[PDB]
Design a protein around this ligand. Structure first.
Ligand SMILES: [Mg+2]
Ligand SMILES: [Mg+2]
Ligand SMILES: [Mg+2]
Ligand SMILES: [Mg+2]
Ligand SMILES: [Mg+2]
Lengths: 55, 117, 151, 54
RNA sequence: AGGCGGCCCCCUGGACGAAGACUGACGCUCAGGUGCGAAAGCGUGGGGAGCAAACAGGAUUAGAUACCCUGGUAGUCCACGCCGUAAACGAUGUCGACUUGGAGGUUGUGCCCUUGAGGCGUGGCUUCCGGAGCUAACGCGUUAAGUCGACCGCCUGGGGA
């Protein structure tokens, strides 16, 4: 949201299996959901968060 | 022969069938049995009950290594997803952990057309 | 029974022993309304069952009944074009009747010379759980437990 | 998803099955067993919006 | 418009908003013209994991040149170039003005103990309802199918086409 480096804030928005949690469950404003998924997407590329529980 | 005592039960449960494979932590195959094996064909093979006796028959050809603890890896939908683990726990096994491993593409390969039955 | 459920008629007790239960038995064994001849086969078998069992008369009956009593059964069901077999836990009241009905049915399917003898050797066999009717209880469990999966 | 634990269990499984109802596994495998045309997946999405009006 | 969906960069089009300066009718539409334009299709050369017309095989059926199954070639991907059509649809041509409302979603901007994840407004988009009116009716209804104006396209029984 304010940054992909905030893995602390970001972990609260993923499931046990690393899937992005929809705005519905979180009740997050609609603009930031996007900022959030894009920052989660950035953190995944950089191996700061997993794509899947598998690895 | 040989000793393991800490293993893993891999179950492949498709709609037409389910297959049980027992393994060590490394992934080396210890024993296996399938639903189509124990008789049952077509309409009967694809049942939880047929999956149950597969799980039973698999433990009757692996305790040669004397397993005592294991984790479970559930792949596929259909029956014998759920009933297979139960038969396992009753065969004399403390079951430690369960995890679903059904593969999920991140939308890659195109599947077959819908069946117009 | 689409809408109207009912209570059950609670037949009179057996004239000789005063048991509603054994009255439920003669009815199950009775044929063509020959009541007069129905209690005749049931008692004479108990007289044969009593002597040979020794162990009273009222209790001897139940020991055989204790066995063929079935705890569970299966109920047919048609969901998505498939006749699934759903195993239901069955109530005590009916549990004895089945025990009674299979005991009665195996006796005619027997080799002996008369009905009193067929009946006596069936109770005796059942007392040791080793007859036709017990196997019917065992098939019920074999048929059940198979569909243990659905419940 | 994933599951283990407690000395007094074998009912962790009730957990496991409720974890998969939560995760959408069986639903997901059905969705992909067979190809769905884009127009069709657009058609599915509308029908449920409408029903999600009380 | 057709259509565009993982992450990052380079290039680039348009839209909205706040505030004030500048030009000063420079606008609207548009036959002919031009360009764009899904999918299949065609040309050469790539590419080729899945899927799959054709085709083969196995089933089903009275038949089964089909629906099911096992296979599977073009094709679907890239480059360059052709074709220019679709239920290319909101089946609703562009612009501009005017006429009660309620619930939302999206995105800007002013004000308020930022004292809350809000309170007051004010823009552009958008969804569902719904008044008047309009409608053959279904319906539409400030995003009009109402109220009027500018201009283009098109319609004139069905078939034959
Ligand atoms: Mg080509
Ligand atoms: Mg085919
Ligand atoms: Mg045309
Ligand atoms: Mg309306
Ligand atoms: Mg107008």
């Amino acid at each position: 949201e304010i940054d992909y480096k905030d893995i602390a804030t970001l972990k609260n928005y993923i499931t046990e299996s690393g899937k992005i949690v929809p705005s519905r469950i979180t009740g997050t404003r609609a603009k930031y959901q996007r900022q959030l998924a894009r920052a989660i997407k950035r953190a995944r590329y950089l191996s700061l968060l997993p794509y899947t529980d598998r690895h | 022969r040989k000793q393991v005592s800490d293993g893993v039960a891999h179950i492949h449960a498709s709609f037409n069938n389910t297959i049980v494979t027992i393994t060590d932590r490394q992934g080396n195959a210890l024993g296996w049995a399938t639903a189509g094996g124990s008789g049952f064909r077509g309409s009967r093979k694809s049942t939880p009950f047929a999956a149950q006796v597969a799980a039973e028959r698999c433990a009757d050809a692996v305790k040669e290594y004397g397993i005592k603890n294991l984790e479970v890896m559930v792949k596929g939908p259909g029956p014998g997803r759920e009933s297979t683990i139960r038969a396992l726990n009753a065969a004399g096994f403390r079951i430690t952990n369960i995890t679903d491993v059904t593969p999920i593409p991140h939308n890659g390969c195109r599947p077959p057309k819908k069946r117009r039955v | 029974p689409r809408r109207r459920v009912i209570g059950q008629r609670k037949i009179l007790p057996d004239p000789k022993f005063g048991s509603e239960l054994l009255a439920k038995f003669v009815n199950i064994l009775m044929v063509d309304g020959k009541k007069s001849t129905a209690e005749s086969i049931v008692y004479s078998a108990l007289e044969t069952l009593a002597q040979r069992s020794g162990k009273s008369e009222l209790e001897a009956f139940e020991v055989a009944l204790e066995n063929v009593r079935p705890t569970v059964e299966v109920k047919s069901r048609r969901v998505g074009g498939s006749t699934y077999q759903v195993p239901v836990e069955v109530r005590p009241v009916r549990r004895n009747a089945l025990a009674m009905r299979w005991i009665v049915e195996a006796a005619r399917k027997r080799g002996d010379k008369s009905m009193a003898l067929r009946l006596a050797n069936e109770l005796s066999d059942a007392a040791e759980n080793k007859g036709t009717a017990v196997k019917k209880r065992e098939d019920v469990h074999r048929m059940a437990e198979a569909n243990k999966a659905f419940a | 998803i994933k599951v283990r634990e407690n000395e007094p269990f074998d009912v962790a499984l009730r957990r496991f099955k409720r974890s998969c109802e939560k995760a959408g596994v069986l639903a997901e495998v059905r969705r992909r067993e067979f190809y769905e045309k884009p127009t069709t997946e657009r058609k599915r999405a509308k029908a449920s919006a409408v029903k999600r009006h009380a």
